[PDB]
Amino acid sequence: SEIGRLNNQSLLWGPYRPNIYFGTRPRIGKSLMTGLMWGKIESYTDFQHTVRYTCEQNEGMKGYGWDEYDPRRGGIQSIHDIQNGLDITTSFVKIPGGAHGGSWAARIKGTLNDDAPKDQKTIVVFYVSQEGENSELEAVPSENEFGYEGDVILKGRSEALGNYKLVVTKGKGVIPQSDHDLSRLRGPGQTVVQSLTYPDEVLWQAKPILFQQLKAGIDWLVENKYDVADPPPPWQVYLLANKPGSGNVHIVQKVFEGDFEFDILFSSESAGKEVTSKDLEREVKQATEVFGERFARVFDLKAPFQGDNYKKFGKSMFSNLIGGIGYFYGHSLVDRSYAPEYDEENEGFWEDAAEARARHQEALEGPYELFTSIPSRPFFPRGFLWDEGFHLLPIADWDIDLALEIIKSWYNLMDEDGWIAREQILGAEARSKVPKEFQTQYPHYANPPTLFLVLDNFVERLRKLDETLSTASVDNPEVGLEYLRRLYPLLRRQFDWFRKTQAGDIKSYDREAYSTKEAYRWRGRTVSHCLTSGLDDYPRPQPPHPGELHVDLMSWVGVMVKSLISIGSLLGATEDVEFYTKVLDAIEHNLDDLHWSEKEGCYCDATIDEFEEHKLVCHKGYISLFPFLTGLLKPDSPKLGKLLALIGDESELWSPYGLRSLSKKDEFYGTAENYWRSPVWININYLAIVQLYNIATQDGPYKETARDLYTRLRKNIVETVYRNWEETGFAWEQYNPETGKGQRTQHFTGWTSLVVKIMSGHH
Numbered sequence: 001s002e003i004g005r006l007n008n009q010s011l012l013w014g015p016y017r018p019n020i021y022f023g024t025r026p027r028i029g030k031s032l033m034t035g036l037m038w039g040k041i042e043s044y045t046d047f048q049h050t051v052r053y054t055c056e057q058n059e060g061m062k063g064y065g066w067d068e069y070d071p072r073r074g075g076i077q078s079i080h081d082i083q084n085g086l087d088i089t090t091s092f093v094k095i096p097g098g099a100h101g102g103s104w105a106a107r108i109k110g111t112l113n114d115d116a117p118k119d120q121k122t123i124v125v126f127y128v129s130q131e132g133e134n135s136e137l138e139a140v141p142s143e144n145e146f147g148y149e150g151d152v153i154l155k156g157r158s159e160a161l162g163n164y165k166l167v168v169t170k171g172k173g174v175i176p177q178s179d180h181d182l183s184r185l186r187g188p189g190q191t192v193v194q195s196l197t198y199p200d201e202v203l204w205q206a207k208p209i210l211f212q213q214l215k216a217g218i219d220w221l222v223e224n225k226y227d228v229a230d231p232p233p234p235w236q237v238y239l240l241a242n243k244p245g246s247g248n249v250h251i252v253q254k255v256f257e258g259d260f261e262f263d264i265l266f267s268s269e270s271a272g273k274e275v276t277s278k279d280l281e282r283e284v285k286q287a288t289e290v291f292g293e294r295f296a297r298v299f300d301l302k303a304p305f306q307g308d309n310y311k312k313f314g315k316s317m318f319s320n321l322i323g324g325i326g327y328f329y330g331h332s333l334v335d336r337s338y339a340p341e342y343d344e345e346n347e348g349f350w351e352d353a354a355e356a357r358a359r360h361q362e363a364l365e366g367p368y369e370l371f372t373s374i375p376s377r378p379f380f381p382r383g384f385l386w387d388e389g390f391h392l393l394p395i396a397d398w399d400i401d402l403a404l405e406i407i408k409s410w411y412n413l414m415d416e417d418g419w420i421a422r423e424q425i426l427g428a429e430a431r432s433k434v435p436k437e438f439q440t441q442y443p444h445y446a447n448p449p450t451l452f453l454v455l456d457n458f459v460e461r462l463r464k465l466d467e468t469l470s471t472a473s474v475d476n477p478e479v480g481l482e483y484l485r486r487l488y489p490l491l492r493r494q495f496d497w498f499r500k501t502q503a504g505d506i507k508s509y510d511r512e513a514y515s516t517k518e519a520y521r522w523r524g525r526t527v528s529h530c531l532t533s534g535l536d537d538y539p540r541p542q543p544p545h546p547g548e549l550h551v552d553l554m555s556w557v558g559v560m561v562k563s564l565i566s567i568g569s570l571l572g573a574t575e576d577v578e579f580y581t582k583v584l585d586a587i588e589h590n591l592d593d594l595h596w597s598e599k600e601g602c603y604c605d606a607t608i609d610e611f612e613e614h615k616l617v618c619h620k621g622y623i624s625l626f627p628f629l630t631g632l633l634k635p636d637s638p639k640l641g642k643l644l645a646l647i648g649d650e651s652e653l654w655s656p657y658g659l660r661s662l663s664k665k666d667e668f669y670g671t672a673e674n675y676w677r678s679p680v681w682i683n684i685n686y687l688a689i690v691q692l693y694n695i696a697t698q699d700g701p702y703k704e705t706a707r708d709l710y711t712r713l714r715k716n717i718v719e720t721v722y723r724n725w726e727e728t729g730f731a732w733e734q735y736n737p738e739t740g741k742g743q744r745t746q747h748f749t750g751w752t753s754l755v756v757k758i759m760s761g762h763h
C-alpha cells in the first residue's frame with residue numbers, strides 16, 4: 001500500500017500523449033492536458049498545411065523520437081522536420097514534491113536547418129485544456145496593450161491537482177514586427193493568449209479549435225477593411241487577437257523569426273517553491289546522468305556490440321519504446337450481442353459471423369483507462385495485447401515496478417468472463433485515428449497471452465527514491481507476493497476464458513489422443529486471415545473449419561499453465577497447482593498426438609477432411625516451431641532437434657537477416673499481402689533467440705548446435721535492425737529476407753526494440 005502510493009505519486013505526470021509530437025497529461029481521465037504545435041508561414045494559405053500536431057511519417061518529416069527517456073524522470077525528444085526547415089528538441093523533466101504528483105518543466109528549442117531561409121517565420125502554439133466540473137484555469141492578463149512582453153502565467157485549480165500555476169516563458173529569439181496599420185489595433189507583434197470554453201468532450205480537438213480562432217481573426221480583417229489592396233504580413237494575419245481570461249481552453253501563440261526557444265513551467269502549489277528555468281536546466285542535466293548510469297548497468301551490450309555505435313543504437317531503440325508510454329481514457333466500441341453465430345460451430349461460420357456483425361449491435365461502453373506502451377506513434381498509438389507482452393520485456397529490465405503497473409493496468413480492463421479486448425481504442429481522441437469498421441471489439445476474440453512472459457521474468461527475479469522505486473517489487477519479497485496475490489485470480493480467470501471460448505473439438509470426430517480435453521482453435525478467422533493469433537495472414541487450413549486445431553494457441557495455453565504453476569506455488573494454491581500440473585502434462589502429450597508431423601519433421605495446425613478425418617496441414621515457418629518458441633520442449637527432445645534443423649536450414653527458414661516467417665519451400669511463400677508469409681519479424685526471432693540460448697547453456701545433445709545458431713541468429717537480427725537504423729533512422733515493423741531492407745511501418749517501437757535485450761544478452 002505504501003509502495004503503491006509512492007509509485008502513483010512517481011508516475012502520475014508525463015508526456016503521456018505519444019499520439020502527438022509533444023504534449024503532457026497526468027494519469028487521470030478528466031484533467032489538465034497540454035500540446036505543442038508549430039509551422040512555418042510563408043504565404044496567406046500555407047500554415048494550415050505546414051502546422052504540426054498529431055504524429056505522422058511522410059517525405060516531409062526526416063524523423064523524430066526520444067534520445068533518452070525514463071517516465072519517472074523525463075527525457076529529450078529530437079524532431080527533424082523537413083517541411084518546416086526545423087530541428088526541434090523537446091526536453092521534459094519531473095520535479096517530485098507536494099501531494100499532487102509533483103511538478104514538471106519542458107524546454108522547446110527550434111533550430112532552422114541549413115536549407116531554411118534564415119528569416120523564416122515560425123508560428124508556435126502551446127495549447128492547454130482542462131476537463132472537469134469543478135475546476136478552474138485562468139490566464140493572468142498582461143500589463144501591455146495587445147499581448148505579452150514576457151511570461152504568460154495560467155493559474156488553475158482542481159480536486160485532482162489542487163492549486164497549480166503553468167508558465168509559458170518569454171523565450172529567446174527574434175520576434176518579427178509589423179509596420180502595418182493593423183498594428184494600431186493588433187499590436188506590432190507579441191505573444192498572445194486566447195482563453196475559451198467548449199463542452200469538455202471536444203477539448204482534445206486542438207487543431208480545429210485553433211483554426212476556428214484563426215478563421216474568426218481573418219473574418220475580422222475582412223470586415224474591418226484589411227484587404228488585398230494593402231494586406232498585413234501573413235504572420236500577422238495568422239496572429240490571434242489577445243483575449244486572456246478564464247476558460248477550459250487556453251491558446252498561447254508566439255511567432256519567431258529565425259531560431260527560437262521557450263520554457264513551460266508547471267508548479268504544483270502543494271510542493272515547495274515554484275519551478276524556475278534554472279531548475280529545468282539542472283534537472284535535465286541530472287536526468288541524462290542517471291539515464292547514462294542506468295543504461296550501462298541494465299543494458300550492458302555484449303560482444304560484438306560493445307562499441308559506441310551500437311550503444312547509441314540501443315539507446316535509441318530503448319528510449320523510443322519506453323518513450324511510447326501513453327495514458328488513454330474513454331469509452332470503447334464493443335459488440336455485446338454474443339450472437340450465436342460467433343460460436344463458429346458450423347462449416348462456413350465466417351459467413352454467419354459476418355451476418356451477425358452486419359446487425360451492428362456494438363455500442364460504446366466504459367469509460368476505461370489504460371497506461372501502456374504502444375507499437376507505433378504515427379500509425380497506431382494505442383494498446384495491443386500480445387504486443388505489450390514483448391514491449392515490457394526490456395521495460396521490466398529497466399524498471400520492474402513500471403512494467404507491473406502496466407500489467408496491472410491491462411488486467412484491470414478484464415471483464416467478468418475473463419476477456420480483455422486485443423486492441424484498446426479508448427475515447428474519441430483515440431477513435432479519430434481509426435475507421436469505424438475497425439473500432440468494434442468482439443468478446444470472443446483472443447490474442448496471445450504474452451504478458452505471462454513478463455510475469456515469468458518477474459517470478460524468476462523474485463526467487464533470486466527513483467532508483468529504489470524502480471525495483472521495490474523485487475527488493476521487498478512481500479510487496480511482490482501481494483501483487484501476485486491480487487493478480488493471480490485474473491490470470492486464472494483469463495486461463496479459464498481461453499479454455500471456454502477457444503476450445504477445439506476432439507470428442508466429436510475420428511480423433512485419438514492422450515487427453516480428451518486439450519485442444520484449441522482461435523475464434524475469428526476468415527478465409528484468408530487469422531487476426532487473433534497475431535500472425536495475420538500466416539497460411540492456415542483451407543477452408544477454415546470448426547474442426548481446426550492451432551498448434552500456436554495450444555502452446556500459449558502451455559505458456560499460461562506453466563506461469564500459473566509458479567504463481568500458484570508461491571501463493572500455496574495447492575489444489576490449483578495440482579490441476580494445472582495435469583493440464584500441462586496433457587498439453588505435452590496432445591501437442592505430439594494432435595500436432596506433430598513425423599513425415600514433415602515439425603508441428604502443424606490440424607483440420608478435418610472432406611471425409612471427417614483429422615488431417616495435418618503443414619506450412620513450415622514460425623507456427624511450425626511454436627512448442628520450441630514457447631519453451632515447452634525438453635532439451636533432449638528429438639522433436640526439438642528436428643526443429644533445430646528446420647530453423648538452421650537456409651533453404652527453409654534461415655536467411656542471412658534472421659528467420660523467415662514462412663519457408664521459401666512453402667506454396668504460400670511471398671503470396672497475397674505477404675505480411676507473415678516470408679518477412680523477418682523481430683518478436684518471433686527474439687523468442688527463438690532466447691530458446692536457443694536456453695539449450696546452449698545446459699547439458700544436452702543439442703548444446704553445441706544451439707550455441708552456433710544462437711550466436712549467428714543474434715548477430716543476424718541485431719545487425720539487420722542496426723544497419724536499417726543507421727541508414728534510415730527508423731525501427732521497422734519487419735525486414736526483407738532477400739534484401740535485408742526494413743519494410744512496412746516505420747517508428748515501430750514496437751517489439752522491434754527487443755533488439756536492446758538481444759544485444760545485452762545473459763538470458
Ligand SMILES: OC[C@@H]1[C@@H](O)[C@H](O)[C@@H](O)CN1CCCCCCNc1cc(-c2cccnn2)cc(C2CC2)c1
Nearest residue numbers: 375378379380384386387433434533534535536744745
Ligand atoms: O503491432 C500491432 C499489430 C500486431 O498485433 C499484429 O500481430 C500485426 O500483424 C500487425 N500489427 C499492427 C496492426 C495494426 C492495424 C491498424 C493499422 N492501421 C493503419 C496503418 C497505417 C499505415 C500507413 C503507412 C503504411 N502502413 N500502414 C496508417 C494508419 C493511420 C492513422 C492513419 C493506420
